[PDB]
Design a protein around this ligand. Structure first.
Ligand SMILES: CCCCCCCCCCCCCCCCCC(=O)OC[C@H](COP(=O)([O-])OCC(O)COP(=O)([O-])OC[C@@H](COC(=O)CCCCCCCCCCCCCCCCC)OC(=O)CCCCCCCCCCCCCCCCC)OC(=O)CCCCCCCCCCCCCCCCC
Ligand SMILES: COC1=C(OC)C(=O)C(C/C=C(/C)CC/C=C(/C)CC/C=C(/C)CC/C=C(\C)CC/C=C(\C)CC/C=C(\C)CC/C=C(/C)CC/C=C(/C)CC/C=C(/C)CCC=C(C)C)=C(C)C1=O
Ligand SMILES: CCCCCCCCCCCCCCCCC[C@@H](O)O[C@H](CO[C@H](O)CCCCCCCCCCCCCCC)COP(=O)(O)OCC[N+](C)(C)C
Ligand SMILES: NC(=O)C1=CN([C@@H]2O[C@H](COP(=O)(O)OP(=O)(O)OC[C@H]3O[C@@H](n4cnc5c(N)ncnc54)[C@H](OP(=O)(O)O)[C@@H]3O)[C@@H](O)[C@H]2O)C=CC1
Ligand code: SF4
Ligand code: SF4
Ligand code: SF4
Ligand SMILES: [Zn+2]
Lengths: 156, 342, 208, 144, 115, 176, 96, 63
């Protein structure tokens, strides 16, 4: 057809624009924020992929949960996740954010940030190396590339 | 009972409830509440979806690890329906549109799809089927929505004789098109009401009550081939209801009467939207139609649900429609509306 | 005996024993016992009523001068009538020495606040109250410090379970985080590791 | 000296196989360096070397355009490197698998696989133990 | 004399007056809590919840335990007033997400093994 | 032995006062900072071209777990459960029984990689070099359930990464 | 030695396969079931039995310090071979 | 001064334990029996307190 070709091209353009410009929230909790900083360091240079930290949640595309989520912090994490304008994505970093990790049986730790917010990518490690988080970010970019919003809208 | 399905635990997130449910239309207003209630108990929920997987993210925190499974299906393909209902012992049908899209008309989403779902569930060994129809569904109504609802209800009953049929009435909640719909027309200066809303009676029902009733019908042995009417505790005139809606939102209420032909015309004009229409002619017909009273049918009180009145839950929906001046106003400040109770 | 065994220091042992006797002689009203460990650590056990006098003497006396409070914490021993044991670790910069002061309490008897003597104690006592439930009298601001708001019970106590009593999740029906009774997908596995053969004969207890 | 760096740039353009190859590598790898080919892979990857670069840039891989079943012209990832070249490329050794091949075992995968997350080949966990308690089976014959 | 020292109160009467003083503060605070946190409950509902929380500990006869309970109630009041708590913490008092556990013998027998 | 960091006072010479005045009025120190940053502008950046270039690693590197085999193809693991007893995070679950030939082999071997802290105590404890931490670190998934490994996944990881795990062990087992 | 269940599901080395009526097979719908294709029991069964000229033999699994702890096997029974308790290799004295 | 409380000690309201896990629980106060597999007796010296065993079930995922 002709309309489906147009919506496919528009999907390609929108997904390309969205994945090339991924702005994570300046958000970090524990040990894994250090490796995220090292990803921002000159050796890996997360800026060169179009990925720059921005403090305000209203100006953020991705949330990287890097560290332990505690019961005291869970409302704050949910609050800053809800204030992100959509489309928004969540990357889980390290054992503590993935499933509770080394404090899984604690009384004050949330066993996985996916009990609080929906997670798109699970990066494993304690902590994941800077290339591990870079691999996760590029995997999220490929996942964004694979989405088809206007093709599904056109077929409704 | 197939040992792998014997209930275990305290009915929490990590428990086993023995329920394996395929929830059709789980990405809608009612579907999220139904999936939340099922995953609270520790049930295996199968979530069939046709939309973008991004639009299913909100359903993932609703179950434990492995308890919510997302599969792609096509409404017009029966192999997909077999794939998603093959291993389930309960099937819930919440599929439905409020407008007719170019690819699916009313009898495609209310007649063909429910019938195919029911037949494949019956021939796949599914034990329980829950079908959601409308309270005002009859074959002689001016609304194509309700005519298709009645035809599909009878055809589903034909294809699955022991199916439970539930007929709610004007579900109101946070992501609803009822309370929200009325609040949304404040911008158009006035509120157009056919005959000023003095000849229409509504009995809206809370969303949580409908979800609880569906869950109770799932686990009620006596509700196999029955039909339920899910209605609220109070009946309101449409004028009084909209007046209360605007009073809770703290907006100025300026209603005016509009003839049926002109307001149908503006509905038809709005229908041309390639996206979700603001209103349609069928929406007009349903809005200005009185609610049927079916006292012979079982209701929420027969499933143990005490219907929640609108006055205790309208603020949680209509506070979003307030301005900064009235944002902190409390619940018991807005003088509950006049009720047409018998 | 040289390569793998930690060497001894008898000079420090004698000095600490002499100073322990000194502190015991000066404060007979409160001091109940003085010990010196086999690795040269001086411990002084006192009656709970003497926290302020003993700490003030140890901070201000010219001979002692223990100006810095290194750490203040509690130890829980449920088999004792006075359940909780309050431990003060002080450091002397003038004489390059460290002392430890220990007292006791239970769930209902308050311990006098040590904030006037040491400014650093204000957070430490808040944490002791938060983790063990020991109330400190005359504290300028006593409240929870480490636990979540509205947290019920004290985590550090032995009776409290490792995983607690409630857990958190987000509920889309109420659109907020909620607390529910803890349910575990995999229960923590308890290990019985103690050997039934005695390891250290020097610590054998009388068999009653 | 400026003319010489211009010569070096022109030689980089020429040594990639003309302008088409130059543009291809520039738009795929975002780098136009030329190094000695250490070896080629079983799947189409090529591994180059340049000892005059600083530690970290002296080794690199140009990924294949066609892995097991997908087109990796644009979509490449680090999980596409087989374990022997994985050891060489991460500088855990100075010996390429061409000079020092790994030991051959019958159970070693003869076909490497990338990260298959998000595809139908993804790993789905399950319990690997058998049923613990057996239930009594009632007789098939009537009793009265 | 049982060799026990008080915290604040020496008999049940001072404990009761402190309880009453604390109760008034909580009762007074309830409407401000409902407005500030933007709760979807009525002031009557919150005051009934405060009453229930006070009556959960009506069986205590030890003045020391009553003093400690009043101290904890003061800390709770302080958190609410200063907005340290979040709608989450305030609404944890109502248990909206919890299915009511049955109390009769037959339901417990049908569901499982717990008494 | 100590030194002072900030107890120097400046000379009151007329030319020294004039130099300080010139620094205040003409911003010489700020120009020095600009010069430092300009000198960095003309240096070669430290960025590597990921994913086409990788950061350096070591044979000791702890990566994705794997279950190994003997050269004959028999599994090395004998279900001693020393790895399970030493795991600081309790991430390992093991069940065993006699095999059909009477061999002592596991029937369940799971590692929860969202509990694992990647400390490597399990492979130090193992007496037969059965469980190891391989060199793989690029194994991010899209769901939580994919990080709950069982015996099939771990054996497949071993079969996939043996050619590199064996070489890494060969280069380091003399330090162990 | 992967054999196929009557339902069509692969059977693991442990032997666990879901029964036709098990709802838990739905997790493999639109996805796959992970089964290792090399069975250790069959792979160790292929090894030849080593004949040695001594009553007692020693086994460390090969590789020296890269194998298992060294154990000594008695080979006095003439009706059965001696098997390593770690490696599974079989030894016997020359009979017949 | 001392206030002479002559009541039974009861700290139930201060521990924050849910009232389910105080009234329906039954603890066992005992000296553990010697592991019959060994002759060591060092594990039979102290008194132990443990609670009544409750239900354990199999996880639908991973078992
Ligand atoms: C405006 C004036 C531009 C003058 C200039 O580009 O010369 C810079 C040239 C860069 O030298 P350098 O970066 O110090 O030395 C690094 C090696 O030459 C590094 O050499 P290389 O082996 O990376 O060379 C690769 C080659 C090819 O590189 C490329 O094609 C990628 C960059 C293309 C950009 C367009 O680079 C070039 O030859 C192009 C040089 C700049 C041309 C623009 O030196 C100067 O001429 C400095 C002049 C003063 C400038 C102020
Ligand atoms: C909850 O969902 C809904 C929506 O989604 C958010 C809607 O937009 C919606 C319709 C309301 C729109 C957002 C319209 C808002 C903007 C105006 C109403 C457009 C009309 C205003 C005029 C064109 C001003 C022009 C000036 C005049 C002089 C001409 C409805 C009814 C709804 O219910
Ligand atoms: C008129 C105003 C509205 C539109 C404005 C548009 C502005 C100009 C459009 C910008 C064009 C740039 C898009 C194309 C760049 C894509 C680059 C290329 O690499 O894409 C590849 C795939 O193709 C792209 O996805 C195509 C996307 C563009 C599709 C066609 C554009 C249609 C434009 C239509 C605009 C009309 C709008 C008018 C409405 C009024 C995959 O690349 P990728 O690998 O990921 O990136 C590098 C990662 N590496 C290192 C691993 C390689
Ligand atoms: N809510 C109310 O006020 C009342 C509701 N009901 C009935 O309850 C059911 C659901 O209510 P509600 O959830 O509010 O309706 P929604 O439109 O909010 O949810 C619709 C659901 O149906 C699915 N769906 C719609 N069309 C198709 C299609 N052609 N093929 C496949 N899936 C489709 C949608 O999936 P996607 O999002 O991917 O399209 C979505 O999950 C409907 O049947 C409705 O008639 C009955 C009485 C009143
Ligand atoms: S995963 Fe490990 S490194 Fe990361 S925050 Fe948790 S403990 Fe620290
Ligand atoms: S690496 Fe450490 S935490 Fe992970 S499985 Fe091994 S012992 Fe356990
Ligand atoms: S992996 Fe090693 S340590 Fe763990 S059970 Fe097997 S043989 Fe024992
Ligand atoms: Zn052997």
């Amino acid at each position: 057809s002709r309309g489906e070709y147009v919506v496919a091209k528009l999907d390609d353009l929108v997904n390309w624009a969205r994945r090339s410009s991924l702005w994570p929230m300046t958000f970090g909790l524990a040990c894994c924020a250090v490796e995220m900083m090292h990803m921002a360091a000159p050796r890996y240079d997360m800026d060169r992929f179009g990925v720059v930290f921005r403090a305000s949640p209203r100006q953020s595309d991705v949330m990287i949960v890097a560290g332990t989520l505690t019961n005291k912090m869970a409302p704050a994490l949910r609050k800053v996740y809800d204030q992100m304008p959509e489309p928004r994505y969540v990357v889980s970093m390290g054992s503590c954010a993935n499933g509770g990790g080394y404090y899984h049986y604690s009384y004050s730790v949330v066993r996985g940030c996916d009990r609080i917010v929906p997670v798109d990518i699970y990066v494993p490690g304690c902590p994941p190396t800077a290339e591990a988080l870079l691999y996760g970010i590029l995997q999220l970019q490929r996942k964004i590339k694979r989405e088809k919003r206007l093709r599904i809208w056109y077929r409704r | 009972l197939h040992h792998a399905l014997i209930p275990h635990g305290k009915g929490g997130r990590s428990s086993v409830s023995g329920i394996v449910a395929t929830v059709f239309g789980a990405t809608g207003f009612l579907g999220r509440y139904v999936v939340n209630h099922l995953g609270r108990m520790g049930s295996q929920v199968i979530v069939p979806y046709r939309c973008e997987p991004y639009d299913t993210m909100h359903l993932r925190p609703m179950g434990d690890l492995g308890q919510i499974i997302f599969m792609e299906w096509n409404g017009k393909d029966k192999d997909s329906i077999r794939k998603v209902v093959e291993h389930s012992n309960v099937v819930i049908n919440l599929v439905g549109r409020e407008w007719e899209t170019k690819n699916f008309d009313f009898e495609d989403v209310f007649v063909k799809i429910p019938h195919a779902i029911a037949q494949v569930s019956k021939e796949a060994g599914v034990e329980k089927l829950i079908h959601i129809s409308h309270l005002n569904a009859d074959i002689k109504s001016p609304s194509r929505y309700l005519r298709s609802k009645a035809v599909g209800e009878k055809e589903v009953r034909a294809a699955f004789p022991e199916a439970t049929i539930i007929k709610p009435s004007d579900i109101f909640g946070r992501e609803d098109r009822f309370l929200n719909y009325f609040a949304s027309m404040r911008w158009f200066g006035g509120v157009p009401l056919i005959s000023l809303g003095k000849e229409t009676v509504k009995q809206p029902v809370y969303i949580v009550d409908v979800s609880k009733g569906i869950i109770n019908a799932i686990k009620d042995p006596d509700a196999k081939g029955k039909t339920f009417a899910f209605v609220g505790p109070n009946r309101y005139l449409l004028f009084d209801l909209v007046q209360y809606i605007f009073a809770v939102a703290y907006r100025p209420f300026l209603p005016y009467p509009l003839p049926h032909f002109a307001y149908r015309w503006v509905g038809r004009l709005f229908e041309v939207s390639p996206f979700e229409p603001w209103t349609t002619r069928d929406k007009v017909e349903r809005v200005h139609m009185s609610d049927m009273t079916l006292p012979h049918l079982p209701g929420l009180e027969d499933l143990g649900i005490q219907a929640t009145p609108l006055e205790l839950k309208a603020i949680e929906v209509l506070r979003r429609h307030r301005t900064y001046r009235w944002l902190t106003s409390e619940m018991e400040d807005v003088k509950p509306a006049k009720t047409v109770n018998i | 005996t040289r390569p793998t065994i930690r060497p001894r220091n008898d000079v420090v042992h004698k000095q600490l024993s002499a100073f322990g006797q000194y502190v015991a002689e000066i404060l007979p009203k409160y001091v109940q016992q003085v010990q010196v460990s086999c690795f040269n650590e001086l411990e002084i056990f006192i009656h709970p009523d003497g926290v302020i006098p003993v700490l003030t003497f140890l901070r201000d006396h010219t001979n002692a001068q223990f100006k810095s409070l290194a750490d203040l914490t509690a130890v829980d021993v449920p088999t004792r009538q006075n359940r909780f044991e309050i431990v003060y670790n002080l450091l002397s910069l003038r004489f390059n020495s460290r002392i430890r002061v220990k007292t006791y309490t239970d769930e209902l008897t308050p311990i006098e606040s040590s904030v006037t003597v040491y400014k650093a104690a204000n957070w430490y006592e808040r944490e002791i109250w938060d983790m063990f439930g020991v109330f400190f009298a005359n504290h300028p601001d006593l409240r929870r410090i480490l636990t979540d708001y509205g947290f019920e019970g004290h985590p550090f106590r032995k009776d409290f379970p490792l995983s607690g009593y409630v857990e958190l999740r987000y509920d889309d029906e109420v659109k907020r985080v909620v607390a529910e009774p803890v349910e575990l997908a995999q229960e923590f596995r308890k290990f019985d590791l103690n050997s039934p053969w005695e390891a250290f004969p020097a610590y054998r207890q009388p068999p009653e | 000296e400026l003319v010489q760096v211009l010569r070096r740039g022109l030689q980089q353009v020429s040594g990639h196989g003309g302008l088409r190859g130059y543009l291809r590598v520039l738009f795929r790898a975002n780098d136009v360096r030329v190094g000695t080919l250490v070896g080629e892979d079983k799947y189409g990857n090529k591994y180059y070397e340049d000892n005059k670069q600083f530690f970290g840039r002296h080794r690199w891989v140009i990924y294949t355009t066609e892995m097991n079943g997908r087109d990796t012209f644009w979509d490449v990832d680090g999980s596409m490197v087989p374990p022997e070249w994985h050891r060489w490329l991460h500088c855990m050794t100075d010996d390429p698998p061409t000079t020092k091949p790994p030991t051959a075992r019958k159970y070693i995968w003869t076909n490497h696989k990338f990260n298959v997350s998000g595809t139908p080949q993804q790993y789905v966990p399950y319990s690997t133990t058998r049923k613990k308690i057996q239930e009594w089976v009632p007789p098939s014959t009537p009793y009265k | 004399g049982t060799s026990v020292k008080p915290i604040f109160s020496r008999d049940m009467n001072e404990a009761k007056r402190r309880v009453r003083e604390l109760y008034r503060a909580w009762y007074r605070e309830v409407p401000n809590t409902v407005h500030l946190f933007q709760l979807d409950i009525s002031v009557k509902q919150g005051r009934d919840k405060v009453r229930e929380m006070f009556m959960k500990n009506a069986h205590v006869t030890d003045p020391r335990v009553v003093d400690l309970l009043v101290i904890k109630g003061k800390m709770e009041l302080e958190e609410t007033i200063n907005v340290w708590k979040q709608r989450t913490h305030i609404m944890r008092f109502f248990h909206e997400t919890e299915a009511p556990r049955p109390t009769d013998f037959l339901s417990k027998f049908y569901v499982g093994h717990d008494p | 032995t100590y030194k002072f960091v900030n107890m120097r006072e400046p000379s009151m010479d007329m030319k020294s006062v004039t130099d300080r005045a010139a620094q205040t009025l003409l911003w010489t120190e700020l120009v020095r900072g600009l010069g430092m940053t300009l000198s960095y502008l003309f240096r070669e950046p430290a960025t590597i071209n990921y994913p086409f270039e990788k950061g350096p690693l070591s044979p000791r590197f702890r990566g994705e777990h794997a279950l190994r085999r003997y050269p004959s193809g028999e599994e090395r693991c004998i279900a001693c459960k020393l790895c399970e007893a030493v795991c600081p995070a309790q991430a390992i679950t093991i069940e065993a029984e006699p095999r059909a030939d009477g061999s002592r082999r596991t029937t369940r071997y799971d590692i929860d990689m969202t509990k694992c802290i990647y400390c490597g105590f399990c492979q130090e404890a193992c007496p037969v070099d059965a469980i190891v931490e391989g060199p793989n670190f690029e194994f991010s998934t899209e769901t939580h359930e994919e990080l709950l490994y069982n015996k099939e996944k771990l054996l497949n990881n071993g079969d996939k990464w043996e050619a590199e795990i064996a070489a890494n062990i060969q280069a380091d087992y003399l330090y162990r | 030695g992967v054999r196929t269940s009557p339902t069509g599901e692969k059977v693991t080395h442990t032997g666990q396969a879901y029964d036709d009526g098990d709802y838990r097979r739905v997790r493999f719908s639109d996805r796959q079931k992970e089964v290792n294709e090399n069975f250790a029991i069959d792979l160790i069964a292929e090894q030849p039995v080593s004949e040695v000229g001594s009553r007692v033999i020693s086994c460390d699994g090969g590789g020296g310090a890269l194998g298992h702890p060294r154990v000594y096997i008695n080979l006095d029974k003439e009706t059965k071979t001696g098997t390593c308790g770690y490696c599974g290799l079989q030894f016997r004295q020359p009979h017949h | 001064q001392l206030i002479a409380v002559d009541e039974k000690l009861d700290i139930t309201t201060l521990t924050g334990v849910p009232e389910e896990h105080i009234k329906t629980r039954k603890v066992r106060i005992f000296v553990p029996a010697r592991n019959n597999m060994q002759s060591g007796v060092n594990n039979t010296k102290k008194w132990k307190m443990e609670f009544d065993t409750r239900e354990r079930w199999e996880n639908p995922l991973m078992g």
